[PDB]
Amino acid sequence: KVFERCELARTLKRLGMDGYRGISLANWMCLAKWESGYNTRATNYNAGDRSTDYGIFQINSRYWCNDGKTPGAVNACHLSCSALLQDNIADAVACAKRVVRDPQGIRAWVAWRNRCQNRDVRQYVQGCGV
Ligand SMILES: *C[C@@H](O)CO[C@@H]1O[C@H](CO)[C@@H](O[C@@H]2O[C@H](CO)[C@@H](O)[C@H](O)[C@@H]2O)[C@H](O)[C@H]1NC(C)=O
DSSP, X not given: OBOOHHHHHHHHHHTTOTTBTTBOHHHHHHHHHHHHTTBTTOEEEETTTTEEEETTTTEETTTTEEOSOOTTOOOTXXXXXXXXXXXXXXXXXXXXXXXXXXXXXXXXXXXXXXXXXXXXXXXXXXXXXX
């Protein structure tokens, strides 16, 4: 499914993402827009990683979810990648929380560094009442 902008902001807030590890909701919204366009079905091949990125937060099958076809994968989220392709984002959020718990943190997403970091991110949550 493709989330409406404020629909996602409220869902992410309800699931505890606002301020999770210091990362504000606006920042999460920004990475989600740039990564998948708020689309839970988005999957993109990672060219230099022999893996695939899955879902709304574009999580990498080499380190976080097992898709059954990635060479030398780890599966730190202990999730099957298809779980990150469902309309219900509860598993995707738990996994994204898992990702930011590593040293690199939010820097694990190049889209956040190129489009959100050192940028105004207010626009993503403007008018959502979150
Ligand atoms: C979404 C895809 O295009 C890129 O995904 C990111 O890929 C990098 C590696 O290129 C992942 O970083 C790794 O994270 C490991 C655990 O923290 C670490 O051991 C390894 O050295 C490297 O830093 C990154 O997690 C991944 N991001 C996502 C959201 O999947």
